[PDB]
Amino acid sequence: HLESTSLYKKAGSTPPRGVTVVNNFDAKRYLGTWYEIARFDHRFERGLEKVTATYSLRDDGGLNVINKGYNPDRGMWQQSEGKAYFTGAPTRAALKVSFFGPFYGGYNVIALDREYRHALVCGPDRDYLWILSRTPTISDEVKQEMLAVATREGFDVSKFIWVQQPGS
Amino acid sequence: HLESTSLYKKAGSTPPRGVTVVNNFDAKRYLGTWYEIARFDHRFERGLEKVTATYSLRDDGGLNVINKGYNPDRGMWQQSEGKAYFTGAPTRAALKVSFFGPFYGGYNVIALDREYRHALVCGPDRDYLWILSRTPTISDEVKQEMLAVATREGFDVSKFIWVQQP
Numbered sequence: 001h002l003e004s005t006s007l008y009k010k011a012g013s014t015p016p017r018g019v020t021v022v023n024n025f026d027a028k029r030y031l032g033t034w035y036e037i038a039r040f041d042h043r044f045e046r047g048l049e050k051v052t053a054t055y056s057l058r059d060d061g062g063l064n065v066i067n068k069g070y071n072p073d074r075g076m077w078q079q080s081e082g083k084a085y086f087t088g089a090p091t092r093a094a095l096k097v098s099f100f101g102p103f104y105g106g107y108n109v110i111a112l113d114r115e116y117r118h119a120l121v122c123g124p125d126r127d128y129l130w131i132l133s134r135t136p137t138i139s140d141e142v143k144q145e146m147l148a149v150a151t152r153e154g155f156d157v158s159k160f161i162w163v164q165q166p167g168s
Numbered sequence: 169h170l171e172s173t174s175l176y177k178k179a180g181s182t183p184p185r186g187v188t189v190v191n192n193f194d195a196k197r198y199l200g201t202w203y204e205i206a207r208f209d210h211r212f213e214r215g216l217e218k219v220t221a222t223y224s225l226r227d228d229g230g231l232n233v234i235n236k237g238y239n240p241d242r243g244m245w246q247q248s249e250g251k252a253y254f255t256g257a258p259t260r261a262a263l264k265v266s267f268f269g270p271f272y273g274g275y276n277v278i279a280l281d282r283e284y285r286h287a288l289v290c291g292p293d294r295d296y297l298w299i300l301s302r303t304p305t306i307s308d309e310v311k312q313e314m315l316a317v318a319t320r321e322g323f324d325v326s327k328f329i330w331v332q333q334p
């Protein structure tokens with residue numbers, strides 16, 4: 001049901017002790033739009049609701065990232081653009097991603113269903129975690145499964161902000 | 169005349185296709201205060217006037233990077249403090265810089281005069297470019313030479329904001 005993962009470490013890009021990263025990734029199936037179901041309180045997303053990330057393939061082998069979100073304190077939709085690159089083999093879902101301005105950090109897919117509908121992604125340490133989905137809501141069952149992996153990999157899931165989405 | 173360079177390419181640190189990076193860098197001569205003559209504008213400097221960049225040696229072999237500017241909207245001076253490390257040899261003027269946690273960006277000196285009076289520095293893509301100078305103004309001749317290198321390395325110099333300086 002879930003993609004295979006294995007313990008993976010790269011200095012400066014993965015959390016202490018390593019995390020189980022997807023090891024038979026197919027980047028083409030990760031393209032397009034994902035909704036941010038949940039995030040930890042990442043400084044560079046603070047305040048934002050209805051967040052999405054949209055990935056597209058670049059000529060240089062990286063991905064373009066378009067981040068979109070609504071700031072309820074301003075009543076305005078916002079957008080930013082980043083880049084993503086594999087740090088190693090493209091079958092390992094370990095990348096570096098520009099999360100703000102020119103500053104790149106680790107982006108590690110630590111759970112992924114085999115149909116590329118739902119994903120658990122962590123950053124370079126345990127202050128950075130996302131649940132992503134092809135739909136604006138997920139089932140309680142999918143929520144439990146993603147949370148279970150996060151807990152297994154040492155994250156405190158009570159740090160999640162459950163992001164406002166259509167139908168949420 | 170300008171320092172010699174060699175092509176350096178690494179995704180996440182240099183722009184696509186690589187850029188020519190100074191290859192006989194002597195970091196001690198790069199220390200101290202530089203005026204930001206021009207920047208491509210981005211989030212973390214928008215609206216800033218009278219910007220200086222200040223580099224100092226760290227005990228750990230890195231550089232402290234301070235970026236200071238006057239923010240008219242706040243009516244205050246502000247500064248961000250960061251840490252930069254060479255990604256390779258210390259004679260290659262390519263570094264990685266962080267101002268917040270485990271998030272780093274590429275800093276690449278792509279033109280440098282041999283007396284360390286002016287420099288052209290790019291980030292990890294072609295949205296990031298700076299002209300730095302030991303003096304708050306530069307001559308037309310120096311300005312044109314920097315613009316020519318920028319264009320040579322694929323940058324669009326119409327994106328420059330010419331920063332308010334004394």
Ligand SMILES: CCCCCC/C=C\CCCCCCCCCC(=O)O
Binds near residue numbers: 265273296
């Ligand atoms: C990677 C390019 C090197 C840039 C060097 C100098 C340019 C001006 C300084 C940029 C300041 C960056 C501040 C980052 C903000 C940290 C998170 C936050 O407080 O929101």
